[PDB]
Amino acid sequence: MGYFELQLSALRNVNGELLSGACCDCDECDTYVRVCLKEYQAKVTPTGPCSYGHGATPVLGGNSFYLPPAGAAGDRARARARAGGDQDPGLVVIPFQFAWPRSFTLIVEAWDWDNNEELLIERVSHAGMINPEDRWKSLHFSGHVAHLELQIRVRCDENYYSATCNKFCRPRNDFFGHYTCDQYGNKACMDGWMGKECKEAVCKQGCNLLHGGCTVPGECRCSYGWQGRFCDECVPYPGCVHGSCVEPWQCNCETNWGGLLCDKDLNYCGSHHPCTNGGTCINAEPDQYRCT
């Protein structure tokens, strides 16, 4: 989810001494750096172990040495994607899979390699607060023996966001969604897609989505009972002749037309009539009458 970085750039012990006042023999030390990441507290500044993680460098040089800068690129794959023998000492990487508490206590030590605790060169502490910012932060110190220049930074892992590295967002384009992720870790639906999970597609423009749908963006496939390019006209009762529909399977007959399929003339005589001698016809039952 995230990792704490430490970039050592300079360490200076001109006298070549230990913190105990003794000599590294004042013919030079073999200096390596330990890093202790633990809980930040209140008043009870001394309690034991590195609960948030720990790190160590190999011997980097002698009494005093200066380390090159790195590169404002490859930052992610240099610290979190390499095989054994990570050939960059001075970069201490402490990954974490919990919610970053922001408040922390950093203890950085300088040691002498010999082959024991009486070989500590310099111990340095600093408790404070830091947020997952992609910007380094400089820390300089001047102890009784050594002088150190550090650069620390907290960083959310790729696809993890927010100031606690807990919000997750990984880009996707498959069965379960079509989207990317943004600055703040929210989903950005790819063009043609919508919805809370960028799962629902955008259909043909004009498609009545009350009765139509689409599996691929740009389609318009109607439901059962609706038809047309836009799925907006109902399918009437098959056999409907003098009728219409508003809902599917309806055969709403027209004026003076009746029966199921609207094929029965109720006003037989006011239309194609049968009367004789200018008498008088009257409508009587579908397709029937009386002409007197």
Residue numbers in the entry: 27 to 51, 62, 65 to 153, 158 to 334
The publication says:
The Notch signalling pathway is conserved across all metazoan species and plays key roles in many aspects of cell biology including cell‐fate determination, stem cell maintenance, immune system activation and angiogenesis in humans (Guruharsha et al, 2012; Bray, 2016). Aberrant Notch signalling results in a number of inherited and acquired disorders, including various cancers, and it is therefore a key target for therapeutic intervention (Hansson et al, 2004; Groth & Fortini, 2012). Both the Notch receptors and the ligands are single‐pass type I transmembrane proteins, and direct protein–protein contact between adjacent cells initiates an intracellular signalling pathway. All of the Notch ligands have a modular extracellular architecture consisting of an N‐terminal C2 domain (formerly known as the MNNL domain), a Delta/Serrate/Lag‐2 (DSL) domain, and either 16 (Jagged1/Jagged2), 8 (Delta‐like1/Delta‐like4) or 7 (Delta‐like3) EGF repeats.
Here, we present the first structures of Jagged2 (N‐EGF2 and N‐EGF3), which has only 58% sequence identity with human Jagged1 (N‐EGF3), together with the longest known structure of a Delta‐like4 ligand (human Delta‐like4 N‐EGF3). Two crystal forms of Jagged2 (N‐EGF2) (green) and one crystal form of Jagged2 (N‐EGF3) (dark green) were solved, including a total of seven crystallographically independent copies of N‐EGF2, and 1 copy of N‐EGF3 (N.b. not all of EGF3 is visible in the electron density). However, the angle between adjacent domains can vary subtly, resulting in the ligand structures appearing to fall into two groups, one group including Jagged1, Delta‐like1 and some structures of Jagged2, and the other including Delta‐like4, and some structures of Jagged2. The observation that Jagged2 is split across the two groups suggests that there is some flexibility between adjacent domains of the Notch ligands and that all may be able to adopt these different conformations. The Jagged1 and Jagged2 C2 domains bind calcium ions (shown in red), whereas Delta‐like4 and Delta‐like1 do not; the aspartates involved in calcium binding are not conserved in Delta‐like4 and Delta‐like1. Both Jagged1 and Jagged2 contain N‐glycosylation sites in the loop between strands 5 and 6.
